[PDB]
Design an enzyme around this catalytic site. Structure first.
Site: not given
Ligand code: 2GP
Lengths: 96, 96
Positions: B54, B65, B69, B85
């Site tokens: 990501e 942020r 993404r 998100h």
């Molecule tokens: N919903 C979601 N969040 C992810 C995933 N992999 C990483 N994330 C990150 O893990 C956090 C929750 O444990 C989420 O807020 C997201 O943060 P980011 O906004 O940094 O991407 C995924 O598969 N699903």
């Protein structure tokens, strides 16, 4: 024994995804999709080895392949759902 | 599921910026940029852990942020945009 029938509309949505993939013969997400189901506990009717095959029903949020599967038999529309890793099965009714 | 393909030129301009940073291997504005995306919700196709990463798409004016993404997959040209998100994704077409 099969624990009756369940409407497809009542199952998790991923069950429909799996049935669609079975209808097209994949491509499937997991390498274990489509292996023979041995029916070791005789919960489904006894058949020759190879009659039944198993396919993953994805469980969103799970870190593994989870416990949800569709088992096919050779008869038309002979599709069974298990949500509990082969402990219980229901015949899927795709018309409801 | 992926909600279709969208031309790069149809996305916010910041998406172009993030793609250019990915191509140069940074530097990135946020420390989270480049972490693994788990695909926990199974919205994207099932793949091995670490197949997806990501990267932030900056939202103008935001203090945080935000919700935009790009998710890369390992395949050539495999890049997904989300503006919500991780609820929905579209594949990015860099050719238009
Ligand atoms: N919903 C979601 N969040 C992810 C995933 N992999 C990483 N994330 C990150 O893990 C956090 C929750 O444990 C989420 O807020 C997201 O943060 P980011 O906004 O940094 O991407 C995924 O598969 N699903």
């Amino acid at each position: 024994d099969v624990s009756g029938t369940v409407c497809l509309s009542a199952l998790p949505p991923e069950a429909t995804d799996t049935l669609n993939l079975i209808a097209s013969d994949g491509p499937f997400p997991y390498s274990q999709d489509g292996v023979v189901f041995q029916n070791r506990e005789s919960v489904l009717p006894t058949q020759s080895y190879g009659y039944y095959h198993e396919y993953t029903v994805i469980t969103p949020g799970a870190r593994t392949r989870g416990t949800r599967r569709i088992i096919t038999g050779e008869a038309t529309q002979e599709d069974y759902y298990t949500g509990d890793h082969y402990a219980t099965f229901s015949l899927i009714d795709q018309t409801c």
